[PDB]
Ligand binder design. Structure first.
Ligand SMILES: Cc1cn([C@H]2C[C@H](OP(=O)(O)O)[C@@H](COP(=O)(O)O)O2)c(=O)[nH]c1=O
Ligand SMILES: [Ca+2]
Length: 129
């Protein structure tokens, strides 16, 4: 896979963010994860975690997987990086996202993220407390 440039337009919630990619505004949905909705338990904490990570980054990048690059709602589907650190992984590692929505052929980082979930669960963090 390849990292590509993007810039933050606006944080949205734990697993979606609005970015400018190739000069166009897009909502991105993070691959392979599910955060609680803002209205649910840990939702506000997941939103705040992803907001801080993307707002504090000097450099945002997106990395598309091998399959679909957009979903049925027109959201980009990607791995997002903040100063080199994967947001999708970091939210799972802190127990603020579950591994989810693992579709065949857009699942390059599945094992990396399942290892992060196992660690968060062993630590009883957040969702796993
Ligand atoms: C993450 C992901 C979500 N989606 C779709 C499945 C779900 O459809 P439904 O809306 O019909 O439930 C929705 C979940 O996104 P949210 O968790 O952002 O609600 O997005 C994909 O199609 N591909 C993906 O990789
Ligand atoms: Ca969600």
């Amino acid at each position: 896979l390849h990292k590509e440039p993007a810039t933050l337009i606006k944080a949205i919630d734990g697993d979606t963010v609005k970015l400018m990619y190739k000069g166009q505004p897009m909502t991105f949905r993070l691959l392979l994860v599910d955060t609680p909705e803002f209205n649910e338990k840990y939702g506000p904490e997941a939103s705040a975690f992803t907001k801080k990570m993307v707002e504090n980054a000097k450099k945002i990048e997106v990395e598309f997987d091998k399959g679909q690059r957009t979903d049925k709602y027109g959201r980009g589907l990607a791995y997002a990086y903040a100063d080199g650190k994967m947001v999708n992984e970091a939210a799972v590692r802190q127990g603020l996202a579950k591994v989810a929505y693992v579709y065949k052929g857009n699942n390059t980082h599945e094992q990396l993220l399942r290892k992060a979930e196992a660690q968060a669960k062993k630590e009883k963090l957040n969702i796993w407390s």
